[PDB]
Each structure stands twice: as structure tokens, then as C-alpha cells.
Design a protein around this motif. Sequence first.
Motif, short mmCIF file in Angstrom:
data_model
loop_
_atom_site.label_atom_id
_atom_site.label_comp_id
_atom_site.label_asym_id
_atom_site.label_seq_id
_atom_site.Cartn_x
_atom_site.Cartn_y
_atom_site.Cartn_z
N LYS A 1 1.15 -1.63 0.19
CA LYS A 1 0.01 0.49 -0.36
C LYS A 1 0.81 1.37 0.49
O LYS A 1 0.47 2.11 -0.32
N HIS A 2 1.79 1.64 0.60
CA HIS A 2 2.65 2.55 0.20
C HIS A 2 3.81 2.44 -0.71
O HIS A 2 4.15 3.68 -1.47
N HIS B 1 2.35 17.61 8.29
CA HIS B 1 1.64 18.02 7.75
C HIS B 1 1.45 19.83 6.82
O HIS B 1 1.09 20.31 6.17
N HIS C 1 4.79 8.82 4.10
CA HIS C 1 3.77 7.47 4.88
C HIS C 1 2.87 7.78 4.62
O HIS C 1 1.93 7.15 5.89
N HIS C 2 2.09 8.20 4.28
CA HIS C 2 0.53 9.01 4.35
C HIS C 2 0.51 9.25 5.93
O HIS C 2 -0.51 9.73 6.23
N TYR C 3 1.39 10.20 6.13
CA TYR C 3 1.65 11.14 7.41
C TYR C 3 0.95 10.11 8.55
O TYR C 3 0.39 10.40 9.38
N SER C 4 1.92 8.88 8.65
CA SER C 4 2.30 8.75 10.27
C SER C 4 3.40 8.07 10.26
O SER C 4 4.87 8.17 9.49
N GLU D 1 8.33 12.00 -3.51
CA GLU D 1 7.65 10.99 -2.73
C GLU D 1 7.43 9.95 -2.46
O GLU D 1 6.85 10.11 -1.21
#
Lengths: 425, 425
Positions: free
Chosen positions: B63-64, B123, B187-190, B403
Motif C-alpha cells: 500500500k505505500h 502536515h 508514509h501517508h502522514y504516519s 515522494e
Amino acid sequence: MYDAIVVGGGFSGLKAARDLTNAGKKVLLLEGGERLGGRAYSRESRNVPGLRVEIGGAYLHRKHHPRLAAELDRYGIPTAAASEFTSFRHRLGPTAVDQAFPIPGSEAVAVEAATYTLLRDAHRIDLEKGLENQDLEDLDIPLNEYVDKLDLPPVSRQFLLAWAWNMLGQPADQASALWMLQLVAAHHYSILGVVLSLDEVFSNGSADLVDAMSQEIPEIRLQTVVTGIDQSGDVVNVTVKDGHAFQAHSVIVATPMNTWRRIVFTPALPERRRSVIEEGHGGQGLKILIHVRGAEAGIECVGDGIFPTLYDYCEVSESERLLVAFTDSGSFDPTDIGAVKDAVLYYLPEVEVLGIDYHDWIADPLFEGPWVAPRVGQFSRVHKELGEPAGRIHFVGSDVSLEFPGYIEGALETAECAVNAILHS
Amino acid sequence: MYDAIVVGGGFSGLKAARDLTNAGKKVLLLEGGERLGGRAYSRESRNVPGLRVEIGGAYLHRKHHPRLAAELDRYGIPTAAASEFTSFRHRLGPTAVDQAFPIPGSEAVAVEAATYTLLRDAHRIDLEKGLENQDLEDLDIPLNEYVDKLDLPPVSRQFLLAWAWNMLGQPADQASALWMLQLVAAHHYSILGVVLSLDEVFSNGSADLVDAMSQEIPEIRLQTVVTGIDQSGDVVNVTVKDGHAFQAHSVIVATPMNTWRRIVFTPALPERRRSVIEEGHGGQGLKILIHVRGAEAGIECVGDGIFPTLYDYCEVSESERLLVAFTDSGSFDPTDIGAVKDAVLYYLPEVEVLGIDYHDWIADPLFEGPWVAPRVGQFSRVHKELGEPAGRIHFVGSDVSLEFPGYIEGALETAECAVNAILHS
Ligand SMILES: Cc1cc2nc3c(=O)[nH]c(=O)nc-3n(C[C@H](O)[C@H](O)[C@H](O)COP(=O)(O)OP(=O)(O)OC[C@H]3O[C@@H](n4cnc5c(N)ncnc54)[C@H](O)[C@@H]3O)c2cc1C
Ligand SMILES: Cc1cc2nc3c(=O)[nH]c(=O)nc-3n(C[C@H](O)[C@H](O)[C@H](O)COP(=O)(O)OP(=O)(O)OC[C@H]3O[C@@H](n4cnc5c(N)ncnc54)[C@H](O)[C@@H]3O)c2cc1C
Ligand SMILES: NCCc1c[nH]c2ccc(O)cc12
Ligand SMILES: NCCc1c[nH]c2ccc(O)cc12
């Protein structure tokens, strides 16, 4: 005539009366009931002769409640750890883990993300400004829609909702998301801390502190229900159910918000306040003490039940205990003991219900309510002003605290503020 | 002469060469070493004859890493779960709990608060803009000062720092806090997801995929080291160590950033880029495979050791295993086996070190570096531009991905972008 009449002998009224007195003012405290303490109410168990229980507010946390901490320290009043939880019997689905924080690793990422969102939103709230003065209407929506937008996976979702139901005393469809975020803000911008503040109790009950404070108040009249507050003249005139009026330069209303509508104010209260006052807040917190056999010590249960929370309260004997359940009074009838049994057995199928005890705060004409929680839409239209003077009439109490509403600390906070205002005016 | 010369046969170069080829272009791939794959390097163990190990990049998460996922699916390349951790042997102090998430309840509030801060800061980063174009200088400071300001209690503090040391391949005093937040953003803001992305491995090694891709590339020359790229004329001229030049309309540099300084570009690269190129990035990731006896399966160790992480890699036999340790090459000498023993025994006092294996990425003249991590101050002065064309010369690779830098996915991402740009130009 007095320098100040205080109406209501809960913690707010008691503090104000005490402090004005100690400042050299001439104070009368009028209390409509037969007891002092208000929504802090220790009394003998209905179920267990000889046993003292808290039927209202019970818990404190010293770092979130410095004013209360100061009162306990002032009078040397002893506190004890709340009952430790050592056994977990949740209903949060098959993936939940049976500990106090029951979120599993598979939900960790989702919780991380929700944690950011919840706290971002909470951080919009400045606690001094009032919930109506901050452009926060977008958050004042039913809690279930707010939570639906977080889109949490099942355990954290239900865990959040259960505690929210406990804490607000409203079902999710009637709670405001804004008020939930207000509680988060009040606890130093902490979701966790909302629950962790269940940290200590009064060793001998809240009456300990009620009595200590009242001893410093020289004039108190019980069974004296205020019906009228008239500041049309030079000096305020306070009318009373079966009795001669009393007069004072200032009056502090330290009764519950939902009772204000039963007092005739002259002149009428500012018109922005009136419709909230007529309607009352939406709090329906219902706290049931449940006398049980077959429960071991240290149980905590959180879940999707009609009781969102069910947990250990006190040892009664070696076989018997009290548990406490929270729900709301619009969703559950506590006099239906069969219902109680079903709610308990949901979590604890080995447990025999012997008895229940509660106070009907809503039916009590001196309260018409447990702790404050707004109806949806209410506090982002008017909140701050509810706790502001109208002329020489002050409004205080937990119900109107901006800093710690719904808690004893907020009673103390609001009183402090009224006292200081008077000592200058 | 070719439509495109690609310099470097890592995943970036391979993709670009393949895709241009399949688009009908005439492509030459020049690779300076004796193998394809670059910093993806499977080979036989130095310690364990007959055993295939990954000496560079190994882990993926579907998924990443969708582009990588697509490559695996395209060629039917099998993946397996990374080794599951079932035994925890942390060094995070006496309050730590021995599970994968070792934070105790007493730190929960502090972690809540840090979680908000870390993600708020992350963010701020828009992944398309570049780290120099976003007013982010205030975050580009040593990681240890950033973390000192979070003021975390001991377990979460050391847990954060240990993983950061692992992931950046720098000690805290040399890592940039901004780059750490960049990884979080990627990492999708994680925060969690930075570690959770250690999710799968190549069943048969990365060479599986290297070979699949290379088979689609018709012209490759190994042992061909580029020394010069000269676009002064109408057609680009590419000079080579011991050989005749090659010519092309376009050239894609798919070599590591820290090697660019060993190529003579004509005309000189835009002057904003040059000092970072001369200095190189600061990455010093050091991955040691450790051959051991007396370790049971499934160990994970995180802590305050010279090895921040030490964990299970593979079964060698019933008594023997490989563990993997991460540290950095400025802090630790892997050829000092006594040091290795001390580092291991710190966490695992029952464990006998038999042997170590690693690749010296820094000493390798075709790399001069493991994965990218900026020096403090570097990427908030120039980052985005490093990966932008100069005339007909393109720059690609993990090192310059906005990215997904430092990962295989970023190699693929940068190549995709160069390919598309060429197919339009
Ligand atoms: C079930 C329950 C659980 C709770 N648990 C906690 C807890 O764990 N921790 C915590 O901090 N807080 C708790 N609380 C909240 C807290 O107890 C209350 O917010 C607080 O005690 C309110 O104090 P007060 O001085 O604002 O008002 P009250 O205590 O409500 O006092 C108001 C007084 O006004 C009197 N009165 C009403 N009308 C008139 C009239 N017209 N004339 C004269 N007198 C009148 C009433 O008799 C009363 O004594 C709980 C409350 C409830 C109901
Ligand atoms: C220890 C380590 C662990 C890692 N772990 C992971 C992981 O778990 N997951 C993940 O996704 N990524 C991992 N990586 C990161 C990842 O492997 C790299 O970022 C990635 O493979 C880089 O690919 P690339 O195509 O950008 O460059 P490279 O793979 O570096 O390829 C560059 C090519 O250029 C060649 N070359 C250099 N100079 C010249 C010259 N002048 N002329 C001709 N050829 C030249 C080199 O020989 C090489 O083949 C790891 C890296 C290392 C070092
Ligand atoms: N004694 C009851 C304490 C309690 C439990 N849950 C609550 C929620 C709100 C509140 O004010 C108080 C409480
Ligand atoms: N195979 C090594 C994987 C790995 C472990 N830690 C890392 C940190 C960064 C990175 O790019 C890769 C890694």
C-alpha cells in the motif's frame, strides 16, 4: 439586608458564601433543600444498610483540579485511589484486547490519524472565549456524524463512543461533537485525560468537604426555595416560596442552569440567554449503583451495551460488591430490574444482580438535570453569556464553567470569579 | 547514437530504459559495475556458504509502494512476510513493556501530545513542492534538538530516537528533524507507518526483479563507468572511462547523488545545485548481518544501544541464525568484531556472535553512500531542483524522489517522471 445573597448550597454557592464572608462581607446563603452539597450527594446505600455511597459526583484529579486540590489540602480532607481495574470484560468485538486500552495493533494507524484530527479540532477551542464566539458552529453537530467522518475501525470507534456516552450523559445522536472537543480541551487538550481524570475519591465522601466549608458560613437557611429575584429597585429583592423576602446589594445564583427557568427574574434576563434557559441543557447522565453477587474485584467493562461502561465501585463483602454503570435516562429505565440484569449479563454473564440504587436528578425539582451537556446547536449560539452577570445578579456553577464544566472544579472556578468581581464592584 | 542513454542500472535506470524501449525509443544502458541492481544487492552470505542474503534494500509495503507492487505483479514475482517478531528484548529502561509497542500507560498522555505535534509539523509538508519551497527552515535543525523540545519521557523518547537512527542512518545530532518529518509525510502522514512498512520481502531476492526488468532491455553495457556528460553540441556526448564515447538526444542520470560529483558535466550544472552535489548527502546507514548462535527465533530489540535496532533476519539452522543490526558508519566500525559482540550482548547476553557481513556502501566508488539522508540545512536550501532536468540531462533515483526517497518506490517514481517528460519532449 445583606451585602450578598447566595442562592444554592452546592460547592459553588458554598465557596462564594465562604469567601465573601472571609472578605468581611455580610452573606446569606439560601438553600432550597434539606441538605448541602447539591449534585455532590453522599448518603446511605438503598441496597446495603450502613453503607455510604456517592450518588452524584465522586471523582477528582489533582493536576486537572487545582482549586479542588486546594480545598482538600486546606481542610486536611483525605482522598484515596479510585478502584483499580485489574480485570477487563469488554464488548468491543473479537479483535479487542482485554486491557484498559483495548485497541489492537491492527487499528494503530487509524488511531494515530484520528488522534491528530481530534486534537486539531480541540485546539480550535480557546477556553476563555466561549463556545459561541470562536467560529465553531461547524463542530456543533451530532457526535455520531462527527465520529462517522473519522471513519474509525470497529474497536476504537466503539471505545470512543462508549466513553463519550459515559462522559456526556447523552447518546451519540444527541451529544454535540463540539462539547466532546470542549471536554478534551478542558483536560489540557487530551482525549486520554478525559478518562484518566477518574483518579481519586473522597475517602469519607464529599460531605466531608461540604461540612468543612459550611462551618465557615455563619448564616444558612435550608428548605428555602427562591422563586423570585427582583433588582428593579436600588437593592435586590429575593422572594421565597413560603416566607418573607430577603434583600441584598448583590445576588449570586448558584443553582443549576435547568432550574433558572423556575425563577421570575425582574427585569427579565438578557434576551440572548432566554431560550436556552427555557429549554434547558440536554444532559441525561444516569449513574446506577448496582449491588451484585458473583463479581470478582477490579472489573472494567467498556462496550456497545446499553451500559457503555460498567465497572467496579466498592467491596460490600467477600461475595458481594457494588458496580457502577453509566448510561442515559432517555435510553434506559433503572426501575426495570430485568433490563438492568440484561445490561449487566451482556458483559458479565456470571453475575447476579441483587439491587440497584440511583438518584433521579431529572425528576428532582431542585435540579432538573444531572451534569451539564448542551443540546446540539445550543452552545455555539450562547454559552459564555450564560455565566455573565445581569446587573447585580451573578450566575455561577459547574453548568456555566468555561474552564471545567460538568465537574466540581468548575463550580469552584465560577465562584472564585464572581467573588472577585463583587469585591471590586 | 541513441534516443536516450541511461547511466546506472539500479531500479530507476532499469525502469526508464525498459519503458523508453517499450515506447519505441532506441536506448542504451551504461552500468559501471559488474552487476545490475545497484543498492538492491542480493549475493551469497560471507558467513554462511550457500546462503543468499540481501545486503542492501530488502523490504517493501504494497500500500505505500504501488509502483513496486505493480512490478511484482507484472512479472509474477513472489513475496513473503518479513520475519514476524515474537520475542522482545528492548533496552528502553525498567518501565518499558516487552512488546512491539513498548510504551507504557504512564507515558500515554505524553505520547498523545507528541503525536499531535509530530503530525502537525509533518502536515506542513506538501510532497510535490520540494523541501526548499515551503518555508520549512525552522524544522531543518538537528533531530536531537527537535526531540528535546518535544520533552518526551524516557521510553517513548528513546524509542523514537532509536527508530530514527535506524531509518535515517544518522545519529540524532546529525539527522535533520525536517527529513524525519518528510519520511512521516511520505508514509501517508504516519509515524507508525515508517516502521510498519517493513512489511514484505522478495522470496527469492531483489535479483528476481532486476533480472525480469533487464531481460526487456536490449542494449546494456556493464563495466562501463561514465566520466563525462557534454551537452554543448546538438547531440549529447557521453564519455566513458576506458572506451569510445556514446551519443544520444537525451541522457538520464540514474546514478547515486553522491557520485554525480565524479562526472564532468558540460556546461556545468545550474549553480544552485553545485554545492550540495560537491558535499554529498549525509546518509551513513549501516546494515550489518550478524551470524549468531544461541538466539531463538523472532527476536526484536530496540533501545539505547550503539545498535538502536537488532532483530531477526533469517533461520540458518536449528541453532544458528542471522540477525540484522542497523547503526551508522560514522559511529560504529563493523570490522571490530569485539565491538559487534558488545553491541549484541547489550541486548542479548546469551548470544554468541559467529560472524558479520555487510557492504561498505560509502567506500564503494559506484555509490559513496547508502540511502539518502540530507545533512542539516541541506534540503530546505535545495532539494526539488536536484531532481529536475538540466537541458537534455535528466536526474532520477531514490536519492531525489520527493515522494518516496530512500526507498525502491522512489527510484520507480522518478523514472516514470523522466520517461514521461522525454516522451513529450
Ligand atoms: C451522577 C453525577 C455524577 C457526577 N460525577 C462527578 C465526578 O465524578 N467529578 C466531578 O467533579 N463532578 C461530578 N459531577 C458533576 C458535579 O457534581 C456538579 O457539576 C457540581 O457538584 C455542581 O455544583 P454546583 O455548585 O454548580 O451546583 P449543585 O451542586 O447542583 O448545587 C445547586 C444547589 O441549588 C439548590 N437549589 C436549586 N434550586 C434552588 C432554589 N430555587 N432555591 C434555593 N436553592 C436551590 C440545590 O438544592 C443545590 O443544593 C457529577 C454529577 C452527577 C449528577
Ligand atoms: C543498506 C541499505 C538498505 C536498504 N533497504 C531498503 C529497503 O528495505 N526498502 C527499500 O525500498 N529500499 C531500501 N534501500 C534503499 C534502496 O535500495 C535504494 O534507494 C535504491 O535501490 C536506489 O535505486 P536507484 O536506481 O536510485 O540507484 P542505485 O540502485 O544506487 O543504482 C545506481 C547505479 O549506478 C551505477 N553507477 C554509479 N556510478 C556510475 C557511473 N559513473 N557510470 C555508470 N554507472 C554508475 C551503480 O553501479 C548502480 O548500479 C536500502 C538501501 C541500502 C543501501
Ligand atoms: N461519580 C461519577 C463520575 C463520572 C463518571 N462519568 C462522568 C462523566 C461526567 C462527569 O461530570 C462525571 C462523571
Ligand atoms: N533492508 C533494509 C531495510 C531498512 C531498514 N531500515 C531502513 C531505513 C531506511 C531505508 O531506506 C531502508 C531501511
